[PDB]
């Protein structure tokens, strides 16, 4: 049997960005609220793993206070209208959990200068 793999493939979108931990993003959603179908826009930072296929969480933080203001955007969700990639940081690690106990001025996703 293969029908489950074709079912996830018709629910996934025909192109989406391949972002990773240490990336910044700008996202637009229509919030599924009511008759106006009104748009909401946001810009933030990714330190959570994407990860792969239909069930990507796409967890984004603002990284500007000692509390991250976390939101789960879901890459393949039909409530999303645009997903845009901005910049990438000088990190090499993918876990990055130490940044959850720092404020935004101590979580600038590294610069290194090698």
């Amino acid at each position: 049997s293969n029908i489950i793999k074709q079912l996830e493939q018709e629910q996934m979108k025909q192109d989406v960005p391949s972002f990773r931990p240490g990336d910044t993003v700008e996202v637009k959603v229509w919030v599924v609220e009511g008759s106006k179908k009104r748009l909401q826009a946001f810009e933030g930072v990714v330190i959570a793993i994407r990860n792969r296929g239909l069930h990507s969480a796409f967890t984004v933080r603002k990284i500007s206070n000692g509390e991250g203001v976390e939101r789960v955007f879901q890459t393949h969700s039909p409530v999303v209208d645009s997903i845009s990639v901005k910049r990438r940081g000088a990190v090499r690690k993918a876990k990055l959990y130490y940044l959850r106990e720092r404020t935004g001025k101590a979580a600038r996703i590294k610069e290194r200068l090698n």
Binding site: S1, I3, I4, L7, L54, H55, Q74, S77, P78
Partner: protein, 209 residues
């Protein structure tokens, strides 16, 4: 009115334009082979032996082999005899596809629970333990006071104590149909289903509806 058997292939989330992701279970329902149709009403009742899969021929004995021989060369395991009342079905041996649910909104699924062994009172009856703070010793995973002091002389039968959990029959009473495609053997349902390889997953239309 009857039911079908088909095998689980996985669980996923379909995603919907209401924002909710709707967790769904995928079942592949190959046409149920039909080993015998009993429309002749012997002893005052009608039935159908819907049949799915077959058992390895080194573990099929002659008392079972002759019980599938009159409808094919393959035999054993799930014969599945269902009774027929207030409904006519075609009189001759003919297999039944999953299109039986293509005009059904709600279903139920019955199978066999996972093995949980020994259990004990706490893991069988989901029972409140005794607190180990401020003393108490030698027993904390017991129900306490199994009868009402001195005048019972006895314990009552079938009470919420002891026993072993799992490896038994279990029903999930309500699931929503999402997609049916009999050319692909496909059944797609909103929800989750009990047990793994011990579970037969007998799926039925809602008899309340």
């Amino acid at each position: 009115m009857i039911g079908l058997v088909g095998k689980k292939v996985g669980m996923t989330r379909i995603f919907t334009e209401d924002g909710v992701s709707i967790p769904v279970t995928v079942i592949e329902v190959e046409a149920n082979r039909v080993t015998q149709v009993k429309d002749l009403a012997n002893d005052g009742y009608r039935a159908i032996q819907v049949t799915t899969g077959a058992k390895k021929a080194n573990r099929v004995t002659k008392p079972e082999a002759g019980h599938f021989a009159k409808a094919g060369v393959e035999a054993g395991r799930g014969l599945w005899e269902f009774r027929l009342a207030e409904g006519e079905e075609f009189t001759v041996g003919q297999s039944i596809s999953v299109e039986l649910f293509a005009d059904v909104k709600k279903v139920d699924v019955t199978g066999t629970s996972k093995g949980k062994g020994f259990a004990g009172t706490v893991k069988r009856w989901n029972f409140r333990t005794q607190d180990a703070t401020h003393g108490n010793s030698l027993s904390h995973r017991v129900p306490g006071s199994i009868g009402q002091n001195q005048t019972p002389g006895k314990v009552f039968k079938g009470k919420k104590m002891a026993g072993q959990m799992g490896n038994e029959r279990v029903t999930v009473q309500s699931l929503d149909v999402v997609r049916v495609d009999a050319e692909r053997n496909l059944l797609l349902v909103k929800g989750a289903v009990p047990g793994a390889t011990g579970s037969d997953l007998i799926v039925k239309p809602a008899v309340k509806a």
